[PDB]
Amino acid sequence: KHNMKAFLDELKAENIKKFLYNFTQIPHLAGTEQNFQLAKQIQSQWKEFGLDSVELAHYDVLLSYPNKTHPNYISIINEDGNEIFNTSLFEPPPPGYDIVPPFSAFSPQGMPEGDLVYVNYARTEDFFKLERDMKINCSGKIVIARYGKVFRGNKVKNAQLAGAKGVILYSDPADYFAPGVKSYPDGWNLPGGGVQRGNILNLNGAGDPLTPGYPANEYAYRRGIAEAVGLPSIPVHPIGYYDAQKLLEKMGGSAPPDSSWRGSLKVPYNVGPGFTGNFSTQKVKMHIHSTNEVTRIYNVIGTLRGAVEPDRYVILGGHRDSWVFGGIDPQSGAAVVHEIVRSFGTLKKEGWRPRRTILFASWDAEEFGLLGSTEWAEENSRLLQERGVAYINADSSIEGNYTLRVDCTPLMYSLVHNLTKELKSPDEGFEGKSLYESWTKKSPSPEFSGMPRISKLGSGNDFEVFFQRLGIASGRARYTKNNKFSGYPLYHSVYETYELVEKFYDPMFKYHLTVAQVRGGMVFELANSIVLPFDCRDYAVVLRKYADKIYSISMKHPQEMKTYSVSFDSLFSAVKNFTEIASKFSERLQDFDKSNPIVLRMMNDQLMFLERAFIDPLGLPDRPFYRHVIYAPSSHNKYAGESFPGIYDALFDIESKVDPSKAWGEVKRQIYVAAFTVQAAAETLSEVA
Amino acid sequence: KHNMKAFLDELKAENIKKFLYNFTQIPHLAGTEQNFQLAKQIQSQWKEFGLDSVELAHYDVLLSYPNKTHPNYISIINEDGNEIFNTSLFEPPPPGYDIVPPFSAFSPQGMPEGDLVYVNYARTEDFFKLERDMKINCSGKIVIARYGKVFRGNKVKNAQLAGAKGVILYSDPADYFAPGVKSYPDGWNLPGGGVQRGNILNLNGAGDPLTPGYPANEYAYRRGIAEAVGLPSIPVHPIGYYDAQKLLEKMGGSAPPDSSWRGSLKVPYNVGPGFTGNFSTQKVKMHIHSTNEVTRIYNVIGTLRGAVEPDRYVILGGHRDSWVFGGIDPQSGAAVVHEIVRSFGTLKKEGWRPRRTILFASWDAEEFGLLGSTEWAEENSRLLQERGVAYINADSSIEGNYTLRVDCTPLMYSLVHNLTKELKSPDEGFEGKSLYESWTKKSPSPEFSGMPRISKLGSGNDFEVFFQRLGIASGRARYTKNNKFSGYPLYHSVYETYELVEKFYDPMFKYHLTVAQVRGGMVFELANSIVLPFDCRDYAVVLRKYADKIYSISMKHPQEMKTYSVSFDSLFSAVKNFTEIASKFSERLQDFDKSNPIVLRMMNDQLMFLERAFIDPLGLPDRPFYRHVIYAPSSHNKYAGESFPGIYDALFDIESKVDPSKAWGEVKRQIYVAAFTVQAAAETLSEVA
Ligand SMILES: *[C@@H]1O[C@H](CO)[C@@H](O[C@@H]2O[C@H](CO)[C@@H](O[C@@H]3O[C@H](CO)[C@@H](O)[C@H](O[C@@H]4O[C@H](CO)[C@@H](O)[C@H](O)[C@@H]4O)[C@@H]3O)[C@H](O)[C@H]2NC(C)=O)[C@H](O)[C@H]1NC(C)=O
Ligand SMILES: *[C@@H]1O[C@H](CO)[C@@H](O[C@@H]2O[C@H](CO)[C@@H](O[C@@H]3O[C@H](CO)[C@@H](O)[C@H](O[C@@H]4O[C@H](CO)[C@@H](O)[C@H](O)[C@@H]4O)[C@@H]3O)[C@H](O)[C@H]2NC(C)=O)[C@H](O)[C@H]1NC(C)=O
Ligand SMILES: *[C@@H]1O[C@H](CO)[C@@H](O[C@@H]2O[C@H](CO)[C@@H](O)[C@H](O)[C@H]2NC(C)=O)[C@H](O)[C@H]1NC(C)=O
Ligand SMILES: *[C@@H]1O[C@H](CO)[C@@H](O[C@@H]2O[C@H](CO)[C@@H](O)[C@H](O)[C@H]2NC(C)=O)[C@H](O)[C@H]1NC(C)=O
Numbered sequence A, B: 001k002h003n004m005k006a007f008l009d010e011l012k013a014e015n016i017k018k019f020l021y022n023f024t025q026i027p028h029l030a031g032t033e034q035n036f037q038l039a040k041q042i043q044s045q046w047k048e049f050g051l052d053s054v055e056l057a058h059y060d061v062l063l064s065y066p067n068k069t070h071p072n073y074i075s076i077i078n079e080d081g082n083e084i085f086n087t088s089l090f091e092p093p094p095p096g097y098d099i100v101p102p103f104s105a106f107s108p109q110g111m112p113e114g115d116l117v118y119v120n121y122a123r124t125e126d127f128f129k130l131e132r133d134m135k136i137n138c139s140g141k142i143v144i145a146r147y148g149k150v151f152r153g154n155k156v157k158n159a160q161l162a163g164a165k166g167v168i169l170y171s172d173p174a175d176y177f178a179p180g181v182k183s184y185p186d187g188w189n190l191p192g193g194g195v196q197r198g199n200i201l202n203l204n205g206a207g208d209p210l211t212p213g214y215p216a217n218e219y220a221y222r223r224g225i226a227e228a229v230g231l232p233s234i235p236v237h238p239i240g241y242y243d244a245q246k247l248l249e250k251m252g253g254s255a256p257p258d259s260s261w262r263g264s265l266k267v268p269y270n271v272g273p274g275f276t277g278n279f280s281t282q283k284v285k286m287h288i289h290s291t292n293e294v295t296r297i298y299n300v301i302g303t304l305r306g307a308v309e310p311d312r313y314v315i316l317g318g319h320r321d322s323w324v325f326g327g328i329d330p331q332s333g334a335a336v337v338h339e340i341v342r343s344f345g346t347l348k349k350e351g352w353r354p355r356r357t358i359l360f361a362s363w364d365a366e367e368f369g370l371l372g373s374t375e376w377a378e379e380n381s382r383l384l385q386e387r388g389v390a391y392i393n394a395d396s397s398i399e400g401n402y403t404l405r406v407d408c409t410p411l412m413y414s415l416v417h418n419l420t421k422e423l424k425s426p427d428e429g430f431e432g433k434s435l436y437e438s439w440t441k442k443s444p445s446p447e448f449s450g451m452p453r454i455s456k457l458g459s460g461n462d463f464e465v466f467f468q469r470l471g472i473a474s475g476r477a478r479y480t481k482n483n484k485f486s487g488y489p490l491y492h493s494v495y496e497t498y499e500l501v502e503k504f505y506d507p508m509f510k511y512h513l514t515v516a517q518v519r520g521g522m523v524f525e526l527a528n529s530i531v532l533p534f535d536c537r538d539y540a541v542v543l544r545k546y547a548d549k550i551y552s553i554s555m556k557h558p559q560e561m562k563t564y565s566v567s568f569d570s571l572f573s574a575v576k577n578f579t580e581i582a583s584k585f586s587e588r589l590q591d592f593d594k595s596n597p598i599v600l601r602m603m604n605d606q607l608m609f610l611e612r613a614f615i616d617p618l619g620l621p622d623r624p625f626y627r628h629v630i631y632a633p634s635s636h637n638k639y640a641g642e643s644f645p646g647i648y649d650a651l652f653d654i655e656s657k658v659d660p661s662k663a664w665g666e667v668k669r670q671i672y673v674a675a676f677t678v679q680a681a682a683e684t685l686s687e688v689a
């Protein structure tokens, strides 16, 4: 037969290993010739594998690159203007190895000099502690912050609003060196010369900074750089912990407020400002000369037309561009997509086609702000909004070898639970056990016994435009470690190679195979199930949890809720209604005359448009491209999903607002929008007439 | 059989006459008890007629009413503060007759006194003439303007931006008294004591001023009045031409610039400012005391469930609220809807159901800014956007007895042409001829021989939210006179009665019957045709005409187009592509395996979503609720549709902009948005995979 099992069995660990090797021999930086050539290779191979059509979609978008003849670096400078210490101009390359040196993409140019302030992880609460409790002023200071806990662009935005004139980011061994494991090349730890590259823009979903709302095509009109979206106003640069030790060792001023501010280096972790008495006249000086330039990028888009519902799209997408070799990020995911394409193409050659159309994407410029996925979705938004069933992401397949990590819409919970019960666990000690069994044991749900944890979708990857802008049901799955938002030690460093993976992560490629089964199996069921595999009742369950949670946040302020008559009754009413209507729709879905394709499709359309109904066409406050009312990327950490974001942000730090009447008025406004949207979504599941 | 003919034959002129009499015996002002009672009557009758469900949908929205104990009026005041002339406190009621006196809905309160300036129709070009050519300054003046040519709210906005401190609107016999016909009650002309009521808000599609974007339900959070949408900042009041003569007769200052500024009254039509020497110390003083108040309104929503595609909605809607008796506006339309409901209910009782669901609406508060239709569409937007096939409006069926007047999307051109060829003409001298024949003869297309004129949709009625906000294919048809935007003489006056219609417009109710056939026939074909009756090729034809037209406007400025490299090539490319793709889609639509319901539906979905594809989720500049890129209400006249509005507005008066580089940059931006949107819409008609 040609069923899911036939699909799954075709997938081979050996093939994933060969593709991973093939994709990781040279760098594939966005906008470079090497990445265009890999695009053309993937396009050819997907054609050979059996897809009906495979095209390149290109765009001209703002990218950022160091100046090859004018390198970026940081100095300690003495009173006479002598640079007495300089940070590294490049990471020591690994054994046997156009490697872009470490930099912060989209940093403006500058050579600011000044006194350092150490700001821990540069989180909102870290800046609250500094400014409110310690009374330390960052204005005109250079801030130094350790990577970890939140997206780096949130750190830079926080530093800018605190008045900093520059930001230095570094990797502390506390966050990036696991006890008892060796530094690369002899283990998976970050060496002291290692550095994490990364974008520091805060685009809030806009895509190419120059063309928000519209694809960056040949005739696009572009904002002038001065009006560009999300560009930092202060220079930024990343360094390793050997270099950080040199900058931090002389720090004076106030001691760290407590131990959660101290990393693992042999330094006091004094907050500053500036250096201890003897060195009080030395300053820190950044030299940043990178340039932003409009550059062509290329997405590969493959189509396998559906036999019955060709106008319904199930999309599997992940990026192809890497900072350097991309041994984990993204090629461990791209190799998995490649093998999934190969397997579906093998069925197709034997005469099978999926029920619905499957689209496969190799996105470009993910590392520069999700630019390739976003521009393509801007170009195709009408098709996606009326035809998009689901989006399954496929960045790094492994970031560890402990257990599965799934983040997805509630609509896909049942699908994921069911599929993982049918798959074998790759884990040591769980042989002959299901993946559901090993996953639930290793990553228990905080709410339910005998259920695994599944997290919310925020941003930090290519699903963002599909889920947060367009309201297409989305999910992702990967293998992870036992530091959730911080990354594995070699993240975005030159050391992230094929050898790292083959030696230290997944020598048998069994975790890669397990992830290929989860991702491919989801795409299979979405594209082939007669009734779409979504359970609206799972949304009802989480909506009640989110409503209890936001209510509980508000109830920290009982006096104000009394004064301003702040009621959550409308929201709990809407949640109750959703729960009632979803229960009845599910009954009908099980009852409906199963011989009737129009009833089936009406019902499939109700299922497909349910995620769509949580979209507000006006967007969230000051974030027009985040339009989902139930989830958004956290305003404090793009990598984290936040629930009832519009109410959450209205409540955040509200006791500090100068006009409480206005602030609480806006809380009430957001409760109204949320209740209304929950009820309207419920009403899409009512009988249609 | 139960075919269109059975439907059409059931419709009776006699029934339309009886309902019209029934709906016009007492006033039905929005927000009053009499209008709630009529809502309940219609709800009961539609149930009796056979509809599956008939519900009231209510909302609490901002309305406006004179103060019953503190009447509005205007004075001429002498130097001592004596009011030597007062305008009327009410219109003399007609023979044999809670009549709200004449007022301008949403006028703020005030008692401004000052010198008059006469501004003709208060159009943009009239204010250009005053300020730029005549060098007359309206700042701190009271402006007096004749009704006609453009929506009254555009006049008030224009007066406000010119610095006026009040506006007096009046009906000139030039525009409202047809030569050779008697004043009411002895003919259809406006008597000198007659006055036209009407809303003067400029909401740009927002609906209830207090709740833009969300329905005005029980738990709605409301803007404070100071942040309300579209509220005028200066008092406004309407008067008849007896009263206007008294205000205009003493006018001094500059003479009218030319004859197009002179109406038909025996006065010089001097522009002012102020009165001629002898009366130079007399001023004009307004007294406006109306109040805005949140008030409950009621829509009646009837459903006739479709037999095959119940999740596809064809909507026939028109309003029920009137200023006074509503003998033409809206009851000549509401009586027609009532008879259409009755006819469809008669088929339904004999076992027939339409293929798709038909929804019937009796909207409330149209006269206060399209509030009932708009709030309902805000509440139901997700259902409408994913399921809405078409909207056919049904305000006044007759505004004359000369010929048909149709305004609609290009998608409905072929439907209208075909249907009118099948209908008998009611016209004198065209007996035994088709309606298409009499219409084409009396209202020839400016472009094509042997084709009738069909106009563009702007605003000025309840289709606005469906077409301009949501992108649902819409149309309207009525009988009209041989003054297009000015209204028939008795418009919004107490004299608009059942007797006006029965005596002077349509004694046999044959024009009403013809309109019932057009509106009902359209709904029939939309709700019952196996393939939706839309022709995408008709859109391709008009897009080329609109592109030629906007290009021709730009080419008034060749030097600037050279300097700023302003090219329309992308737009003509997109138009060419649309034309090519639509031609191929139409071939497939005629070719497709007609046994395949999924191919049919994919194709019906392509047809239904084509209007939807012209919607831009970011809206037009500073008008977020006008989202259609091909059409919008003119920024100078809400009643007029404008094509390529975003480019048109970018070009308008551009030679007066202080920063030409910026102004032309915005023209280029709008060309990019238009080209992109035309191409994206074209791509929805490509093969789906
Ligand atoms: C969850 O689903 C419920 C339906 O099962 C739905 O219930 C509706 O709730 C609304 C708002 O509470 C009810 O509104 C009332 O409507 C009646 C007429 O039917 C009005 O007479 C009444 O008017 C007022 O009473 C008010 C309250 O004191 C007062 O403020 C006014 O001035 C006036 O006197 C209300 O407007 C409605 O009838 C219910 N519909 C039903 C049962 O069919 C919930 O709204 C829904 N939850 C959400 C969040 O949508
Ligand atoms: C109407 O439909 C047409 C398809 O039939 C479609 O045609 C496309 O037009 C675009 C833009 O003109 C073409 O874009 C070129 O793409 C090639 C690769 O295929 C590029 O090499 C080329 O790159 C450049 O050449 C530029 C022009 O001088 C230059 O600016 C650049 O720096 C670079 O050298 C262009 O990007 C595309 O290939 C065509 N597609 C086809 C034939 O399939 C029209 O765009 C469409 N109209 C609209 C308004 O969409
Ligand atoms: C990655 O695999 C691809 C595809 O097998 C290799 O590209 C092929 O190489 C041969 C020999 O040079 C050429 O004749 C073909 O045209 C290529 N096929 C393509 C591009 O589809 C490529 O050599 C491999 N890369 C590495 C680093 O091993
Ligand atoms: C840090 O690098 C800087 C920049 O290259 C070095 O300073 C330069 O040294 C050369 C040779 O002595 C001078 O001629 C340049 O004028 C210097 N440029 C400056 C100061 O910007 C500096 O020596 C390096 N410091 C260390 C510790 O190696």
Ligand SMILES: *[C@@H]1O[C@H](CO)[C@@H](O[C@@H]2O[C@H](CO)[C@@H](O)[C@H](O)[C@H]2NC(C)=O)[C@H](O)[C@H]1NC(C)=O
Residues within 6 Å of the ligand: A414, A415, A418, A532, A533, A534, A535, A590
């Ligand atoms: C997950 O699998 C469960 C168990 O098979 C599915 O739930 C069953 O579905 C069938 C078909 O509707 C019903 O007859 C059973 O009553 C269900 N069992 C239950 C709810 O315990 C469920 O549909 C699957 N989820 C998917 C496919 O998304």
Ligand SMILES: *[C@@H]1O[C@H](CO)[C@@H](O[C@@H]2O[C@H](CO)[C@@H](O)[C@H](O)[C@H]2NC(C)=O)[C@H](O)[C@H]1NC(C)=O
Residues within 6 Å of the ligand: B021, B022, B023, B025, B040, B041, B044, B045
């Ligand atoms: C308009 O017609 C309606 C419906 O025929 C009339 O309302 C009915 O009047 C009778 C007699 O008073 C009542 O018993 C019914 O309850 C009413 N039916 C309804 C409300 O559906 C109404 O009288 C007519 N109005 C005028 C001005 O003639």
Ligand SMILES: *[C@@H]1O[C@H](CO)[C@@H](O[C@@H]2O[C@H](CO)[C@@H](O)[C@H](O)[C@H]2NC(C)=O)[C@H](O)[C@H]1NC(C)=O
Residues within 6 Å of the ligand: B075, B081, B082, B083, B084, B085, B086
């Ligand atoms: C226009 O109406 C005003 C307002 O009613 C009249 O002025 C009032 O006249 C009474 C009786 O003489 C006075 O006691 C009030 O104090 C007046 N109120 C004012 C001036 O605001 C006025 O007489 C009317 N003019 C004409 C021509 O009839």
Ligand SMILES: *[C@@H]1O[C@H](CO)[C@@H](O[C@@H]2O[C@H](CO)[C@@H](O)[C@H](O)[C@H]2NC(C)=O)[C@H](O)[C@H]1NC(C)=O
Residues within 6 Å of the ligand: B414, B415, B418, B532, B533, B534, B535, B590
């Ligand atoms: C208007 O009527 C015309 C003439 O009947 C319809 O056009 C015909 O449609 C049939 C069915 O597709 C074709 O076989 C003929 O070739 C068409 N004749 C033409 C184009 O001259 C047209 O479809 C009708 N428009 C509607 C129903 O919207």
Ligand SMILES: *[C@@H]1O[C@H](CO)[C@@H](O)[C@H](O)[C@H]1NC(C)=O
Residues within 6 Å of the ligand: A067, A068, A069, A070, A291
């Ligand atoms: C890179 O290095 C130097 C420094 O200005 C210069 O020659 C060149 O312009 C720079 N390249 C850029 C700005 O792209």
Ligand SMILES: *[C@@H]1O[C@H](CO)[C@@H](O)[C@H](O)[C@H]1NC(C)=O
Residues within 6 Å of the ligand: A137, A138, A139
């Ligand atoms: C921080 O320091 C700078 C000193 O120039 C000042 O402008 C800013 O207002 C200070 N803020 C506080 C609260 O100390």
Ligand SMILES: *[C@@H]1O[C@H](CO)[C@@H](O)[C@H](O)[C@H]1NC(C)=O
Residues within 6 Å of the ligand: A188, A400, A401, A481, A504, A505
């Ligand atoms: C892979 O699994 C083993 C088992 O605990 C472990 O020793 C090793 O550290 C894991 N690799 C990584 C990179 O976590």
Ligand SMILES: *[C@@H]1O[C@H](CO)[C@@H](O)[C@H](O)[C@H]1NC(C)=O
Residues within 6 Å of the ligand: B067, B068, B069, B070, B291
């Ligand atoms: C109407 O008339 C008078 C004038 O102020 C007053 O008694 C009453 O408040 C007014 N009613 C309103 C403002 O609704």
Ligand SMILES: *[C@@H]1O[C@H](CO)[C@@H](O)[C@H](O)[C@H]1NC(C)=O
Residues within 6 Å of the ligand: B137, B138, B139
């Ligand atoms: C119009 O008149 C007022 C006089 O107070 C003035 O403020 C305004 O600027 C004038 N405009 C012109 C152009 O005369």
Ligand SMILES: *[C@@H]1O[C@H](CO)[C@@H](O)[C@H](O)[C@H]1NC(C)=O
Residues within 6 Å of the ligand: B188, B400, B401, B481, B504, B505
């Ligand atoms: C109705 O038709 C006749 C025919 O010309 C005309 O005399 C009369 O004025 C028309 N009624 C109206 C209101 O136009």
Ligand SMILES: N[C@@H](Cn1oc(=O)[nH]c1=O)C(=O)O
Residues within 6 Å of the ligand: A198, A199, A366, A367, A368, A369, A370, A459, A460, A461, A464, A638
């Ligand atoms: N996955 C990336 C790219 N990045 O993710 C976003 O969401 N924005 C952005 O630049 C990274 O985390 O550095």
Ligand SMILES: N[C@@H](Cn1oc(=O)[nH]c1=O)C(=O)O
Residues within 6 Å of the ligand: B198, B199, B366, B367, B368, B369, B370, B459, B460, B461, B464, B638
């Ligand atoms: N049809 C009306 C009501 N009016 O139409 C709008 O579009 N806005 C508005 O208030 C009138 O023209 O007075």
Ligand SMILES: [Ca+2]
Residues within 6 Å of the ligand: A206, A207, A208, A210, A211, A212, A213, A214, A215, A216, A375, A378
């Ligand atoms: Ca863009």
Ligand SMILES: [Ca+2]
Residues within 6 Å of the ligand: B206, B207, B208, B210, B211, B212, B213, B214, B215, B216, B375, B378
């Ligand atoms: Ca509203």
Ligand SMILES: [Cl-]
Residues within 6 Å of the ligand: A393, A394, A395, A396, A461, A476, A477, A478
């Ligand atoms: Cl992922």
Ligand SMILES: [Cl-]
Residues within 6 Å of the ligand: B393, B394, B395, B396, B461, B476, B477, B478
């Ligand atoms: Cl109408």
